[PDB]
């Protein structure tokens, strides 16, 4: 019967909540009350990358912390040299509604996708020197919202069909399917070890998956509205989620519950993007108020503001060496801050 | 090692030349979002404009040498609050409704127009509204089994507006039924419009040939109103 299953699920949720409350002896704020505040973080726009004609939805730094890919709603995927603002490649996309872009860790490939439900893989190191569509991954029944290369041959994608998928690029087939979200999966983040990843969906929930097994290891709630952004803490034992309820939150995989909420009363706009700095001390978040906020992750105090974007901040990336942070926006400009 | 610096310079110069050409192409095209329900006939509108798995369908047509790119959403879940933000900078949204929905999906269409009008990222986008099933609406009201008053009680005390221009050879009962539905969509538009975007209603049919011109004519008004605003002439 459906009813008895309803009470059984409710009782399971109740006992999970009771166990989580039992494990919650003290708050992270109480433990960190005796830590040194980071003061005021000041950053300046060192570079302004121009050349996109429409909204930027996605950026992704290279593993060399020098090149970066940017995806814009004019069918453009531009590789930039951030040091000199030089453009390396300008790939025209078949569909101009591109919501996500990825850069392969080896640097030989980029990926993109969006409202066409297709993940396009572009080879950057062709023998002739041009950039051609090396692969097209089809099978998602909703739009592509995020994609991250595990390596040159495997990629994990997030779709608006409430599912994530793991694709073997060479054969173009879905190696694995991750299901359990009920809303639109909006963002995925890959763990440093790459055996797990977290996904946040429109059901106001986050899920931790084992890449190899293909099963939902863990589920975290606490947000009130859609989760638009997610990122791991550098050590891989925690992750931050930004939502439309105008708050960011930090979750610990081992504690299995919420640790700290980053919100302010004067903030009434949702978070579009989140990112951690090199040590994980600073949590950067993009907003609809056209700004970015640098929060002290351990204390939940706004350490700084990045301002200079004329429209909604859609993108947020920190380099692997932690030298610079890049923000894309709906004003069609990329900004490199240091 | 400055030779590589020069090589990067010319690679950028070529890329930016191509980007200038692409910008010239991009700014001369009008992008349109086509919305509607299953029983609205917007697919027939696409077929008429063309002849005269995948998550989005695209349509190219030219009116008076001006290029239009109409985008129709397919193979997506009914939850549209996330992918609707991709169309915050289109020239217009073409909203198609079955005017003979009752006997009623008309109230569902009214709320669909309500969400588009008041969405924070679509506040600046004008809506071309197409009352589509006019031929089926005409026969329904004449049959005497329509009874629009049971779904909309305000139709009992409604009177045809003075500015209304009936087509020749049209029953007066059809005219007020036809115009009452338009005023239901117009009261949503008039509220909270604030002059930053407008609604252009049209009484269309399944196979009207002039549907390309109507989109062209409303896009001229939208673009002209935008330039006049930039000069504070409006």
């Amino acid at each position: 019967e459906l009813d008895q299953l309803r009470q059984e699920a409710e009782q399971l949720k109740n006992q999970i909540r009771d166990a989580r409350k039992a494990c919650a002896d003290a708050t992270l704020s109480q433990i960190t009350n005796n830590i040194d505040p980071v003061g005021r973080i000041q950053m300046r726009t060192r570079r302004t990358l121009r050349g996109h004609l429409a909204k930027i939805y996605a950026m992704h730094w290279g593993t060399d912390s020098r090149l970066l890919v940017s995806a814009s709603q004019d069918g453009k995927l531009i590789i930039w040299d951030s040091y000199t603002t030089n453009k390396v490649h300008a790939i025209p996309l078949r569909s101009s509604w591109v919501m996500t872009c990825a850069y392969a860790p080896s640097g030989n490939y980029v990926a993109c996708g969006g409202l066409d439900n297709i993940c396009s893989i572009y080879n950057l190191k062709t023998r002739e020197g041009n950039v051609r569509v090396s692969r097209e991954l089809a099978g998602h029944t909703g739009y592509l919202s995020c994609c991250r290369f595990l390596d040159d041959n495997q990629i994990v994608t997030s779709s608006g069909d409430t599912t994530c998928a793991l694709w073997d690029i060479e054969t173009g087939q879905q190696t694995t399917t991750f299901t359990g979200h009920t809303g639109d999966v909006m963002s995925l983040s890959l763990a440093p070890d790459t055996r797990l990843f977290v996904s946040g969906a429109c059901d106001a929930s986050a899920k931790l998956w084992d890449v190899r097994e293909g099963m939902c290891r863990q589920t975290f709630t606490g947000h009130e509205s859609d989760i638009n952004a997610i990122c791991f803490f550098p050590n891989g034992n925690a992750f931050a989620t930004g939502s439309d309820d105008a708050t960011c939150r930090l979750f610990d995989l081992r504690a299995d519950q919420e640790l700290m909420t980053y919100s302010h009363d004067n903030i009434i706009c949702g978070i579009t993007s989140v990112s951690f700095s090199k040590s994980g001390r600073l949590l950067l978040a993009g907003y609809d108020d056209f700004n970015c906020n640098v929060w002290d992750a351990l204390k939940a105090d706004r350490a700084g503001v990045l301002a200079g974007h004329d429209n909604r901040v859609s993108c947020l990336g920190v380099t692997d060496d932690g030298m610079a942070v890049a923000t894309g926006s709906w004003d069609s400009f990329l900004k490199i801050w240091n | 090692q400055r030779n590589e610096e020069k090589a990067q310079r010319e690679a950028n110069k070529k890329i930016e030349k191509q980007l200038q050409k692409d910008k010239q192409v991009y700014r001369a095209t009008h992008r349109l979002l086509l919305l509607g329900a299953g029983e609205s006939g917007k697919n027939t509108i696409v077929k008429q404009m063309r002849i005269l798995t995948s998550g989005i369908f695209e349509t190219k047509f030219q009116v008076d040498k001006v290029n239009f790119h109409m985008f129709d959403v397919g193979a997506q879940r009914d939850e549209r609050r996330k992918w609707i933000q991709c169309f915050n900078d289109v020239t217009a949204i073409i909203f198609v409704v079955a005017s003979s929905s009752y006997n009623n999906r008309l109230q569902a269409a009214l709320k669909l127009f309500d969400s588009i009008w008041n969405n924070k990222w679509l506040r600046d986008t004008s809506v071309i509204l197409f009352l589509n099933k006019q031929d089926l609406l005409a026969e329904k009201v004449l049959a005497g089994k329509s009874k629009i008053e049971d779904y909309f009680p305000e139709f009992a005390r409604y009177t045809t507006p003075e500015d209304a221009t009936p087509e020749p050879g049209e029953d007066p009962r059809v005219t007020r039924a036809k115009y009452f539905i338009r005023d239901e969509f117009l009261r949503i538009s008039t509220a909270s419009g604030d002059g930053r975007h407008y609604c252009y209603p049209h009484f269309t049919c399944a196979v009207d040939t002039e549907n390309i011109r109507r989109v062209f004519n409303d896009c001229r008004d939208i673009i002209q109103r935008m330039h006049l605003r930039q000069y504070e002439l409006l």
Partner: nanobody
Framework: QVQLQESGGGLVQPGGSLRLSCAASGFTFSNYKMNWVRQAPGKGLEWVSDISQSGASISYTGSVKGRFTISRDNAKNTLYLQMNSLKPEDTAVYYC?????????????????????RGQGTQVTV
């Protein structure tokens, strides 16, 4: 977790009266526009009523004008639908729905098939 519990449904005589209560937990109730939606047997899911954060703005579907009253108590985090003079076509499952984002004028897909912020519903038989 966001949770909406609907109660008060049951079997009522035609022309009778009934009151549906929606207890909302897991979010700031006062920040959100609220809705009542319906699922009649053998057809789709339809929106019937909505109320804003304060209660100043109230709207109904045409078939329930002068018949249903939507009220909201932010202190007890609760929503009410007072149904007067029930008709046999009012027999349906009633779902208390929340708008996806706080203090927003638009409310997309609260009438969708698998909307997350919607309750399990209560059955009203007339």
């Amino acid at each position: 977790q966001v949770q909406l519990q609907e109660s008060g449904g049951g079997l009522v005589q035609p022309g009778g009266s009934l009151r549906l209560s929606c207890a909302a937990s897991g979010f700031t109730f006062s920040n959100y526009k609220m809705n009542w939606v319906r699922q009649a047997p053998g057809k789709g899911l339809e929106w019937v009523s909505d109320i804003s954060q304060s209660g100043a703005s109230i709207s109904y579907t045409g078939s329930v004008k002068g018949r249903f009253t939507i009220s909201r108590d932010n202190a007890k985090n609760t929503l009410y639908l007072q149904m007067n003079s029930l008709k046999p076509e009012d027999t349906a499952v009633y779902y208390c729905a929340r708008c996806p984002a706080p203090f927003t004028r638009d409310c997309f897909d609260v009438t969708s098939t698998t909307y997350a912020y919607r309750g399990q519903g209560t059955q009203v038989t007339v």
